[PDB]
Write a protein that binds this ligand. Structure first.
Ligand code: HEM
Ligand SMILES: [Ca+2]
Ligand SMILES: [Ca+2]
Length: 336
């Protein structure tokens, strides 16, 4: 172990510069360690940066992308042009300054900002953090980011190419437990994906499984589906993945335990963080990441709706027992 200049203890000397980054991010980028939009935007950024990786393209004789190389920042002029990266400009520019001021690679910074950002949201597990990703990168090839307009097969094949199994795709989606949409239906700006956009819990999995009965906005978006109550938005891909026979059972098992959800998401994230890199060549600085406040609330079926309102899509396995909250039907306020 080593004692950094600031007095912080750590396992490797290269972890020291990250305590300075931490203080910078928590005070400015996260405006006081808050769990709001900046956290949600960073989670989109980490996924979009990392997923630009394709062994299949490489085999075909084309550049497949360098994975979690920070290319979304270094080559933002190109990547921010992709329609899948809309609404990320201001966040990318803010992160660029931090990386330059502290002399850290953008690949590492994105991964670090993700771990730190989630510690600001109750219920979040403590994500692993590795440092050492090269600072140089090439822009990601286009069309590598799965979208809400893609079929389930198209999403599984894209993710599978990158190295993810169908169940790991479900595990990664736990991030939609801290989510809203701004560009799918601008009429209802920041309508949340689950009833607790500031709590990393299983509500996302439970609520997407409820029968869709409500149109939250004036019209139904291009990639929107009816949701369970006013104010909540339901993305087409999320609704389909929860019901598809290839992903249904895993989705169903993610409803009953915040504990289990957290572990799987953390393992899946660790895998995504090294796409395009060799983990053995990186240094572990996970001890710099703070713990998030605990979430003691139990999972519930909200609004007086019961388990009978769930569209069980994996009947071959028992549907777990989940608490039920009395009515009335809630009306969600936009995510902060
Ligand atoms: C595997 C298929 C996935 C699809 C098709 C998908 C699609 C989308 C779309 C279209 C939005 C709304 C963006 C906007 O209008 O603001 C969104 C939001 C969001 N997604 Fe995903 N997503 C996927 C996975 C993920 C993953 C793997 C992560 C990260 C670990 C992630 C994190 C988020 C978050 C936190 C938001 C909220 C952003 C906000 O409130 O500003 N998503 N996603
Ligand atoms: Ca990248
Ligand atoms: Ca939530």
């Amino acid at each position: 172990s080593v004692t950094c200049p600031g007095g912080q203890s750590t396992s490797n000397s290269q972890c020291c510069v990250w305590f300075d980054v931490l203080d910078d991010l928590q005070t400015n980028f996260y405006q006081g360690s808050k769990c709001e939009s900046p956290v949600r935007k960073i989670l989109r950024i980490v996924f979009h940066d990392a997923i630009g990786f394709s062994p299949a393209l490489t085999a075909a004789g084309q550049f497949g992308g360098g994975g979690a190389d920070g290319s979304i920042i270094a080559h933002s002029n190109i990547e921010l042009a992709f329609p899948a990266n809309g609404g990320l400009t201001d966040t990318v520019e803010a992160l660029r300054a931090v990386g330059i001021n502290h002399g850290v690679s953008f690949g590492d910074l994105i991964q670090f900002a993700t771990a730190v950002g989630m510690s600001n949201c109750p219920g979040s597990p403590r994500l692993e953090f590795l440092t050492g990703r090269s600072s140089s990168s090439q822009p990601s090839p286009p069309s590598l980011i799965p979208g809400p307009g893609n079929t389930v097969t198209a999403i599984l094949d894209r993710m599978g190419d990158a190295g993810f199994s169908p169940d790991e795709v479900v595990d990664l989606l736990a991030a939609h437990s801290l989510a809203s949409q701004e560009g799918l239906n601008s009429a209802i700006f920041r309508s949340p994906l689950d009833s607790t956009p500031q709590v990393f819990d299983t509500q996302f999995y439970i609520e997407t499984l409820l029968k869709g009965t409500t149109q939250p906005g004036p019209s139904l978006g291009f990639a929107e589906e009816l949701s369970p109550f006013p104010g909540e938005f339901r993305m087409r891909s999320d609704a389909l993945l929860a019901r598809d026979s290839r992903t249904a059972c895993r989705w169903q098992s993610m409803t009953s335990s915040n504990e289990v959800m957290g572990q799987r998401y953390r393992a899946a994230m660790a895998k995504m963080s090294v796409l395009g890199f060799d983990r053995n060549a990186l240094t572990d600085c996970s001890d710099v990441i703070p713990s998030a406040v605990s979430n003691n609330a139990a999972p519930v079926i909200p609004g007086g709706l019961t388990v009978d309102d769930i569209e069980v899509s994996c009947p071959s396995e028992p549907f777990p027992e989940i608490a039920a909250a009395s009515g009335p039907l809630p009306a969600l306020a936009p995510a902060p």
